[PDB]
Design an enzyme around this catalytic site. Sequence first.
Site, PDB file in Angstrom:
ATOM      1  N   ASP A  96      19.216 -23.382  10.859  1.00  0.00           N
ATOM      2  CA  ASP A  96      18.966 -21.950  10.783  1.00  0.00           C
ATOM      3  C   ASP A  96      20.093 -21.210  11.533  1.00  0.00           C
ATOM      4  N   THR A 125      15.560 -15.863   6.750  1.00  0.00           N
ATOM      5  CA  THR A 125      15.300 -17.287   6.776  1.00  0.00           C
ATOM      6  C   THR A 125      14.423 -17.769   5.627  1.00  0.00           C
ATOM      7  N   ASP A 137      19.149  -2.324 -19.104  1.00  0.00           N
ATOM      8  CA  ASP A 137      18.124  -2.961 -18.249  1.00  0.00           C
ATOM      9  C   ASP A 137      17.173  -1.912 -17.648  1.00  0.00           C
ATOM     10  N   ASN A 195      13.906  -2.088 -17.437  1.00  0.00           N
ATOM     11  CA  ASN A 195      12.834  -2.660 -16.625  1.00  0.00           C
ATOM     12  C   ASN A 195      13.360  -3.449 -15.429  1.00  0.00           C
ATOM     13  N   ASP A 198      15.027  -6.241 -14.725  1.00  0.00           N
ATOM     14  CA  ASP A 198      14.698  -7.665 -14.518  1.00  0.00           C
ATOM     15  C   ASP A 198      15.920  -8.568 -14.587  1.00  0.00           C
ATOM     16  N   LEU A 228      17.696  -8.867 -17.168  1.00  0.00           N
ATOM     17  CA  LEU A 228      17.690  -9.435 -18.507  1.00  0.00           C
ATOM     18  C   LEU A 228      17.834  -8.361 -19.616  1.00  0.00           C
TER      19      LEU A 228
HETATM   20  C1  LIG Z   1      15.498 -16.485 -12.786  1.00  0.00           C
HETATM   21  O1  LIG Z   1      14.702 -17.581 -13.229  1.00  0.00           O
HETATM   22  C2  LIG Z   1      13.344 -17.350 -13.495  1.00  0.00           C
HETATM   23  C3  LIG Z   1      12.590 -18.658 -13.785  1.00  0.00           C
HETATM   24  O2  LIG Z   1      13.113 -19.239 -14.966  1.00  0.00           O
HETATM   25  C4  LIG Z   1      13.224 -16.347 -14.639  1.00  0.00           C
HETATM   26  O3  LIG Z   1      11.890 -15.886 -14.596  1.00  0.00           O
HETATM   27  C5  LIG Z   1      11.079 -16.266 -15.730  1.00  0.00           C
HETATM   28  O4  LIG Z   1      11.293 -15.378 -16.815  1.00  0.00           O
HETATM   29  C6  LIG Z   1      10.472 -15.481 -17.967  1.00  0.00           C
HETATM   30  C7  LIG Z   1      10.880 -14.335 -18.898  1.00  0.00           C
HETATM   31  O5  LIG Z   1      10.877 -13.096 -18.197  1.00  0.00           O
HETATM   32  C8  LIG Z   1       8.975 -15.415 -17.606  1.00  0.00           C
HETATM   33  O6  LIG Z   1       8.175 -15.671 -18.755  1.00  0.00           O
HETATM   34  C9  LIG Z   1       6.943 -14.900 -18.741  1.00  0.00           C
HETATM   35  O7  LIG Z   1       5.859 -15.663 -18.239  1.00  0.00           O
HETATM   36  C10 LIG Z   1       4.630 -14.978 -18.072  1.00  0.00           C
HETATM   37  C11 LIG Z   1       3.631 -15.984 -17.507  1.00  0.00           C
HETATM   38  O8  LIG Z   1       4.221 -16.554 -16.361  1.00  0.00           O
HETATM   39  C12 LIG Z   1       3.282 -17.285 -15.535  1.00  0.00           C
HETATM   40  O9  LIG Z   1       3.474 -18.693 -15.596  1.00  0.00           O
HETATM   41  C13 LIG Z   1       4.716 -19.163 -15.074  1.00  0.00           C
HETATM   42  C14 LIG Z   1       4.795 -20.679 -15.249  1.00  0.00           C
HETATM   43  O10 LIG Z   1       4.099 -21.363 -14.217  1.00  0.00           O
HETATM   44  C15 LIG Z   1       3.943 -22.744 -14.612  1.00  0.00           C
HETATM   45  O11 LIG Z   1       5.157 -23.468 -14.784  1.00  0.00           O
HETATM   46  C16 LIG Z   1       5.013 -24.720 -15.461  1.00  0.00           C
HETATM   47  C17 LIG Z   1       5.705 -24.638 -16.822  1.00  0.00           C
HETATM   48  O12 LIG Z   1       7.077 -24.323 -16.640  1.00  0.00           O
HETATM   49  C18 LIG Z   1       3.549 -25.202 -15.577  1.00  0.00           C
HETATM   50  O13 LIG Z   1       3.521 -26.595 -15.843  1.00  0.00           O
HETATM   51  C19 LIG Z   1       2.690 -24.896 -14.329  1.00  0.00           C
HETATM   52  O14 LIG Z   1       1.323 -25.029 -14.665  1.00  0.00           O
HETATM   53  C20 LIG Z   1       3.023 -23.533 -13.675  1.00  0.00           C
HETATM   54  O15 LIG Z   1       1.887 -22.758 -13.319  1.00  0.00           O
HETATM   55  C21 LIG Z   1       4.896 -18.737 -13.607  1.00  0.00           C
HETATM   56  O16 LIG Z   1       6.167 -19.115 -13.125  1.00  0.00           O
HETATM   57  C22 LIG Z   1       4.683 -17.231 -13.414  1.00  0.00           C
HETATM   58  O17 LIG Z   1       4.765 -16.951 -12.024  1.00  0.00           O
HETATM   59  C23 LIG Z   1       4.877 -15.546 -11.704  1.00  0.00           C
HETATM   60  O18 LIG Z   1       3.644 -14.970 -11.297  1.00  0.00           O
HETATM   61  C24 LIG Z   1       3.069 -15.635 -10.174  1.00  0.00           C
HETATM   62  C25 LIG Z   1       1.623 -15.186  -9.923  1.00  0.00           C
HETATM   63  O19 LIG Z   1       1.430 -13.845 -10.315  1.00  0.00           O
HETATM   64  C26 LIG Z   1       3.963 -15.464  -8.937  1.00  0.00           C
HETATM   65  O20 LIG Z   1       3.496 -16.259  -7.869  1.00  0.00           O
HETATM   66  C27 LIG Z   1       5.416 -15.856  -9.228  1.00  0.00           C
HETATM   67  O21 LIG Z   1       6.229 -15.426  -8.146  1.00  0.00           O
HETATM   68  C28 LIG Z   1       5.912 -15.321 -10.589  1.00  0.00           C
HETATM   69  O22 LIG Z   1       6.153 -13.932 -10.478  1.00  0.00           O
HETATM   70  C29 LIG Z   1       7.443 -13.566 -11.012  1.00  0.00           C
HETATM   71  O23 LIG Z   1       7.456 -13.376 -12.433  1.00  0.00           O
HETATM   72  C30 LIG Z   1       6.770 -12.243 -12.956  1.00  0.00           C
HETATM   73  C31 LIG Z   1       6.933 -12.196 -14.477  1.00  0.00           C
HETATM   74  O24 LIG Z   1       6.417 -13.371 -15.066  1.00  0.00           O
HETATM   75  C32 LIG Z   1       7.280 -10.953 -12.302  1.00  0.00           C
HETATM   76  O25 LIG Z   1       6.463  -9.868 -12.691  1.00  0.00           O
HETATM   77  C33 LIG Z   1       7.291 -11.056 -10.771  1.00  0.00           C
HETATM   78  O26 LIG Z   1       7.992  -9.975 -10.207  1.00  0.00           O
HETATM   79  C34 LIG Z   1       7.933 -12.336 -10.240  1.00  0.00           C
HETATM   80  O27 LIG Z   1       9.340 -12.208 -10.275  1.00  0.00           O
HETATM   81  C35 LIG Z   1       3.346 -16.823 -14.067  1.00  0.00           C
HETATM   82  O28 LIG Z   1       2.270 -17.390 -13.346  1.00  0.00           O
HETATM   83  C36 LIG Z   1       4.137 -14.395 -19.400  1.00  0.00           C
HETATM   84  O29 LIG Z   1       3.061 -13.519 -19.134  1.00  0.00           O
HETATM   85  C37 LIG Z   1       5.242 -13.683 -20.211  1.00  0.00           C
HETATM   86  O30 LIG Z   1       4.820 -13.559 -21.567  1.00  0.00           O
HETATM   87  C38 LIG Z   1       4.848 -12.197 -22.087  1.00  0.00           C
HETATM   88  O31 LIG Z   1       6.095 -11.819 -22.689  1.00  0.00           O
HETATM   89  C39 LIG Z   1       6.392 -12.528 -23.902  1.00  0.00           C
HETATM   90  C40 LIG Z   1       7.807 -12.285 -24.436  1.00  0.00           C
HETATM   91  O32 LIG Z   1       8.167 -13.372 -25.269  1.00  0.00           O
HETATM   92  C41 LIG Z   1       5.341 -12.217 -24.971  1.00  0.00           C
HETATM   93  O33 LIG Z   1       5.665 -12.858 -26.189  1.00  0.00           O
HETATM   94  C42 LIG Z   1       3.978 -12.676 -24.441  1.00  0.00           C
HETATM   95  O34 LIG Z   1       2.977 -12.391 -25.398  1.00  0.00           O
HETATM   96  C43 LIG Z   1       3.686 -11.993 -23.090  1.00  0.00           C
HETATM   97  O35 LIG Z   1       3.500 -10.608 -23.333  1.00  0.00           O
HETATM   98  C44 LIG Z   1       2.191 -10.132 -22.949  1.00  0.00           C
HETATM   99  O36 LIG Z   1       2.128  -9.664 -21.606  1.00  0.00           O
HETATM  100  C45 LIG Z   1       3.094  -8.655 -21.329  1.00  0.00           C
HETATM  101  C46 LIG Z   1       3.276  -8.421 -19.822  1.00  0.00           C
HETATM  102  O37 LIG Z   1       2.103  -8.688 -19.079  1.00  0.00           O
HETATM  103  C47 LIG Z   1       2.748  -7.386 -22.120  1.00  0.00           C
HETATM  104  O38 LIG Z   1       3.824  -6.471 -22.080  1.00  0.00           O
HETATM  105  C48 LIG Z   1       2.435  -7.655 -23.603  1.00  0.00           C
HETATM  106  O39 LIG Z   1       1.660  -6.561 -24.068  1.00  0.00           O
HETATM  107  C49 LIG Z   1       1.787  -9.024 -23.933  1.00  0.00           C
HETATM  108  O40 LIG Z   1       0.376  -8.966 -24.003  1.00  0.00           O
HETATM  109  C50 LIG Z   1       6.595 -14.422 -20.150  1.00  0.00           C
HETATM  110  O41 LIG Z   1       6.600 -15.556 -20.993  1.00  0.00           O
HETATM  111  C51 LIG Z   1       8.665 -16.413 -16.477  1.00  0.00           C
HETATM  112  O42 LIG Z   1       7.336 -16.236 -16.035  1.00  0.00           O
HETATM  113  C52 LIG Z   1       9.613 -16.218 -15.288  1.00  0.00           C
HETATM  114  N1  LIG Z   1       9.369 -17.226 -14.267  1.00  0.00           N
HETATM  115  C53 LIG Z   1       9.365 -16.987 -12.954  1.00  0.00           C
HETATM  116  C54 LIG Z   1       9.098 -18.184 -12.069  1.00  0.00           C
HETATM  117  O43 LIG Z   1       9.563 -15.862 -12.477  1.00  0.00           O
HETATM  118  C55 LIG Z   1      14.167 -15.159 -14.411  1.00  0.00           C
HETATM  119  O44 LIG Z   1      14.270 -14.458 -15.615  1.00  0.00           O
HETATM  120  C56 LIG Z   1      15.583 -15.502 -13.943  1.00  0.00           C
HETATM  121  N2  LIG Z   1      16.366 -14.310 -13.594  1.00  0.00           N
HETATM  122  C57 LIG Z   1      17.532 -14.006 -14.217  1.00  0.00           C
HETATM  123  C58 LIG Z   1      18.300 -12.770 -13.823  1.00  0.00           C
HETATM  124  O45 LIG Z   1      18.042 -14.702 -15.101  1.00  0.00           O
HETATM  125 CA   LIG Z   2      15.511  -5.845 -18.988  1.00  0.00          CA
HETATM  126 ZN   LIG Z   3      17.104 -15.233  12.796  1.00  0.00          ZN
END
Ligand SMILES: *[C@@H]1O[C@H](CO)[C@@H](O[C@@H]2O[C@H](CO)[C@@H](O[C@@H]3O[C@H](CO[C@H]4O[C@H](CO[C@H]5O[C@H](CO)[C@@H](O)[C@H](O)[C@@H]5O)[C@@H](O)[C@H](O[C@H]5O[C@H](CO)[C@@H](O)[C@H](O)[C@@H]5O[C@H]5O[C@H](CO)[C@@H](O)[C@H](O)[C@@H]5O)[C@@H]4O)[C@@H](O)[C@H](O[C@H]4O[C@H](CO)[C@@H](O)[C@H](O)[C@@H]4O[C@H]4O[C@H](CO)[C@@H](O)[C@H](O)[C@@H]4O)[C@@H]3O)[C@H](O)[C@H]2NC(C)=O)[C@H](O)[C@H]1NC(C)=O
Ligand SMILES: [Ca+2]
Ligand SMILES: [Zn+2]
EC number: 3.1.4.39
Length: 802
Positions: free
Chosen positions: A117, A155, A679, A681, A683, A685
Site C-alpha cells: 500500500d 486503496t 455518449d 448515458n 457509460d 460506450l
Molecule cells: C468494463 O467492463 C464491464 C464488464 O464487462 C462492462 O460492463 C458490462 O456491460 C454490459 C453492457 O453494458 C452489461 O450488460 C448488462 O447486464 C445487465 C444485467 O447485469 C447483471 O448481471 C451481471 C452478470 O453477473 C453474473 O456474471 C456471470 C456471467 O458472466 C454469472 O455466471 C454470475 O451468475 C454473475 O451473477 C452483473 O455483472 C451485473 O452487476 C451489476 O449490478 C450489480 C448489482 O446491482 C452490481 O453489484 C455490479 O457492480 C454491477 O453494476 C454495474 O453495472 C450496471 C449495469 O449493468 C451499472 O448500472 C452500474 O453502474 C455498475 O457499473 C448485474 O447483476 C442487463 O440488465 C442488461 O440488459 C439490458 O440491456 C440489453 C441490451 O442488449 C437489453 O437487450 C436487455 O433486454 C436489457 O434491457 C432491459 O433493461 C434495461 C435497463 O434496466 C431497460 O432499459 C430496458 O427497457 C430492458 O427492459 C445488460 O445486458 C454488464 O452487466 C456489465 N457488467 C458489469 C460487471 O458492470 C463495461 O461496459 C466496461 N466498460 C467499458 C468502458 O468498456
Molecule cells: Ca453510451
Molecule cells: Zn493511504
Amino acid sequence: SGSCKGRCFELQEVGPPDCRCDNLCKSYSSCCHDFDELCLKTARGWECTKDRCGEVRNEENACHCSEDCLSRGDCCTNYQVVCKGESHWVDDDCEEIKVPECPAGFVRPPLIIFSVDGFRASYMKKGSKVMPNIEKLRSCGTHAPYMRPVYPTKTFPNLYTLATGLYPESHGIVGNSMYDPVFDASFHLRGREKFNHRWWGGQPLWITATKQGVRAGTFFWSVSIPHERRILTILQWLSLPDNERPSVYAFYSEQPDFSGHKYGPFGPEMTNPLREIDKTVGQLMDGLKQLRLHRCVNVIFVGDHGMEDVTCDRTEFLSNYLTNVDDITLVPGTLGRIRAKSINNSKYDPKTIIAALTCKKPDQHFKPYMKQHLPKRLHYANNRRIEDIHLLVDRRWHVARKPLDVYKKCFFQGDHGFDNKVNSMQTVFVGYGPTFKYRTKVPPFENIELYNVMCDLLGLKPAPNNGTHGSLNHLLRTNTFRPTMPDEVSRPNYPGIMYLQSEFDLGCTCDDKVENKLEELNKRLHTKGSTKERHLLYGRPAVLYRTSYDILYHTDFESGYSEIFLMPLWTSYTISKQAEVSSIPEHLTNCVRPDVRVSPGFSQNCLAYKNDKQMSYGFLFPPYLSSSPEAKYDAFLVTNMVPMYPAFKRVWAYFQRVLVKKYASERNGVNVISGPIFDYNYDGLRDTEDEIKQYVEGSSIPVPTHYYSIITSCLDFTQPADKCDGPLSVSSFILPHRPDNDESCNSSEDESKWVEELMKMHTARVRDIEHLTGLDFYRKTSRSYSEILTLKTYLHTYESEI
Ligand SMILES: *[C@@H]1O[C@H](CO)[C@@H](O[C@@H]2O[C@H](CO)[C@@H](O[C@@H]3O[C@H](CO[C@H]4O[C@H](CO[C@H]5O[C@H](CO)[C@@H](O)[C@H](O)[C@@H]5O)[C@@H](O)[C@H](O[C@H]5O[C@H](CO)[C@@H](O)[C@H](O)[C@@H]5O[C@H]5O[C@H](CO)[C@@H](O)[C@H](O)[C@@H]5O)[C@@H]4O)[C@@H](O)[C@H](O[C@H]4O[C@H](CO)[C@@H](O)[C@H](O)[C@@H]4O[C@H]4O[C@H](CO)[C@@H](O)[C@H](O)[C@@H]4O)[C@@H]3O)[C@H](O)[C@H]2NC(C)=O)[C@H](O)[C@H]1NC(C)=O
Ligand SMILES: [Ca+2]
Ligand SMILES: [Zn+2]
Ligand SMILES: O=c1nc2n(c3ccccc13)Cc1ccccc1/C2=C\c1ccc(Br)cc1
Ligand SMILES: [K+]
Ligand code: NA
C-alpha cells in the site's frame, strides 16, 4: 465455544455461530477462545539463532529450528541459513528460470501476490540502497518503470480493480467512502458494513479461481496478525497435500502507506518502513528456497497507488465560495463529491453550485465538474454511488467543507487520491518467476490489465472485464492467450455519382461555379481512391455493429459516412512534414456543397443550422490543410460537416489550423483520424440512435457529446509517417463538445494559452475511443497483433520524466 485445536488458519470458513480459526476471524469478533494461544504464537521471535539449531521441539514457539521442522513445514525462514550453512536467496547470483522446477504433485506453478500500500514508483530507484531483495526481484524478473492506478487513486478502489480487471464505476467500490441511495446505506473503512457482499461487484480473482476448480488461499488478513505470521502461514499452506494446497496466495502490507500519511512520501522516517518491507520479501523468498519452491513460484510485487506531499495549510474551503454550506454533504480530501444534505430539500440546485465554484479565485486549487464532463480517461461517472458534482483537486491540495472540519476531525503530511495521471500517484509492478520473462523491462501499463495476466498464470478463463486481453503478453515467457481481431459487422458501400445538383434542397450555397482532359482524368482517380494509400495508412477501421455507411474518397482525405447519423463516423488524412497551411479564401467562408454520391435524404442541410440559434457547424477534414486550391472544394462537402457549438469551434479551429501542422513538424508527418462520439448515458460506450438526447433544432442531425482524434506517426521519427518500416507512436484525445468554455479559466485569452492545455487534460487511449465508437482501428499493419493492442492501450500523459 469450540476450539482451534488442529485448525489454525483453516482454508474454509465455518458457518455461524460456530467459532472460526481462519485469518479473518479477528475482524468479525468470532475467533475461538484459544486462537491467540495456538495460532498466534510469538515465543522466541522469528529468526533461528546459532544456539537454537537441533533443538528439542517446543510447541510454544513462533517457529522452529528442530531437526524435524523441514518435515513439519514450520521452520523459521532463516533455518537453513543459520543451521545448515545455506545462503540467503538474495546472496545467490540470479539464474534464468527457463522452465518451472517444482516438486512432484504440483500441477502448475503457484502464484503469490505481494501487494504493498502506498508504494510510489520512484521508491524503486530512490530507496534502492535499502531494499536489496525487492531490487533483486526487480532486476532479475520483469518490471515496468511504473504502473498506473485507477481513479480515484485510493486503496480499496485500486485493490479491487487489481482483483477484477474492472473500473471502479463497474466494480462499485468508487471510493474509500460511499453512499448507495438504492440500498439506502453507507460504506466506511472503519466498520462492519464494508463486509457486506452487495457492495462488491464483478468477479474477483479468488471467486474466478474457485468456480474453475483452482484452490485459492483465503486472501485477506485481520490487521493485528503480524507480517511474519502472514508469511509463515503462506509457507505452511504450501506444504499441505496436493488436494488441499491452494494454487494462489495474497500478502498485503499496510506499509509504506501508513507511515507515508504521517511523514510524507520522502520524510526521513520513510527509510525504516522500506527496510521492513524488504525484510519481509527476504523472509518469503528464503522460505520458498527452504521449500525448494524458489524456481517454481510466480511472484507478483505490486502497489495500489503512490503518495504526494500534502499538509493542512493547503486546504481550500467551500465556505469561502458558498454561503449556505450547510445545505450540502461533501465527501472531502483529495477529491470532492457533493450531494444535497437532505432529499426533501428541493431548493438545492447543482447548476448554481457549479457556477459558484467555477473560476472564482485567481489561484483556485480545484475544478468543479458534473461527473459526465470529467475526462473520459478516468471512466468515473456510470455508477449511482458517484455524486453528480465532482471536484478534481490539484496535486498537493485538499478540499474541505468548513475550517472546523480540518482542525477538529497539523496531523498528516502525505495523501493520495488525485487524478491517476499524476506522477506521485504512480506505483510499481515486478513479476518474478518461470512464467515471467528474464531481465525484461516493459513499458508502463494500467493496473486494470493484470486480472487477465493473473488468470493466464493460473490457466483460468477471465470474467469479462476492462483489461485488453493480450496487451500484456510481452510480460510472459509463455501465454495461454493469443488474441484475434474482432470480425467486421457492417460492410461499407462505395457510392458513385448518383445525384444531380438540382435534386438537393438543403439551403446550402457555394461560390464554386468556376473551374480539360488533364485534371478531370486526375480527379476521377481521386474519387476512386488513388491517394488512399497516402491517407488511410493502417487500413479502414472496422465497424463492429449493424449499420449503413459509405466510404467516400477524396484527394486529401477518406471518410466512412453514416447514413444513420448523417455524418462521418471517421475521417482519415495524412499531413506530411512538408505540407503547408493556407486560409479559407473569403468567398468560401459559408460555402457548403452537396455530395452527389449521397442522397438529399441522408444529407444534413444548412437551414437547420440557420434556424438553430445555439448550434453552428465545423468540418472534420480541415479546409486549412487542403493540398491545392482545387482539392479545397472537397473540404466543403455537406458530408464533411458536423454540428459544433460556437464556443467549441474556437477549440477545434485552433487544433486544425495550428496544432495539426505543429505535430506533423515535430513528428515527421502524422496520420489523423477524427470523428464524433455519442455518449449521452455516460457509460463509456457507443450510443444507439434512440439514446441521443440532443438534435440540431427541427432536424434528425444528432449532436455529439465529444469529438476524438487519433494521431499516429513512426516511433522512429527519422522515417516519415507515410513511410514507416517499424513500430508506431500514437496520441489521442476525446474532447468534450460543450456550449461554453467554462472548463478553461483562461478561455477569454488567445487560444495559444489554453487550447493545447485543454487537449492534454482530455488525452485518451485509442481503446477508449473504440468502446465509444464501436470501431476497431489498426486492422492492416506490419506489426504483431499483441504489439497493436499495447499501442491501443497506450495513454500519452504529458507528465515529465518520473
Ligand atoms: C468494463 O467492463 C464491464 C464488464 O464487462 C462492462 O460492463 C458490462 O456491460 C454490459 C453492457 O453494458 C452489461 O450488460 C448488462 O447486464 C445487465 C444485467 O447485469 C447483471 O448481471 C451481471 C452478470 O453477473 C453474473 O456474471 C456471470 C456471467 O458472466 C454469472 O455466471 C454470475 O451468475 C454473475 O451473477 C452483473 O455483472 C451485473 O452487476 C451489476 O449490478 C450489480 C448489482 O446491482 C452490481 O453489484 C455490479 O457492480 C454491477 O453494476 C454495474 O453495472 C450496471 C449495469 O449493468 C451499472 O448500472 C452500474 O453502474 C455498475 O457499473 C448485474 O447483476 C442487463 O440488465 C442488461 O440488459 C439490458 O440491456 C440489453 C441490451 O442488449 C437489453 O437487450 C436487455 O433486454 C436489457 O434491457 C432491459 O433493461 C434495461 C435497463 O434496466 C431497460 O432499459 C430496458 O427497457 C430492458 O427492459 C445488460 O445486458 C454488464 O452487466 C456489465 N457488467 C458489469 C460487471 O458492470 C463495461 O461496459 C466496461 N466498460 C467499458 C468502458 O468498456
Ligand atoms: Ca453510451
Ligand atoms: Zn493511504
Ligand atoms: O489482508 C488484506 N488484504 C486486502 N486488503 C486489506 C485491507 C486492510 C487490512 C488487510 C487487508 C484490502 C483489499 C481491498 C480490496 C480487495 C482486496 C484487498 C486486499 C488484498 C488483495 C488480494 C488480492 C488482490 Br488480486 C488484490 C488485493
Ligand atoms: K446557427
Ligand atoms: Na472560461
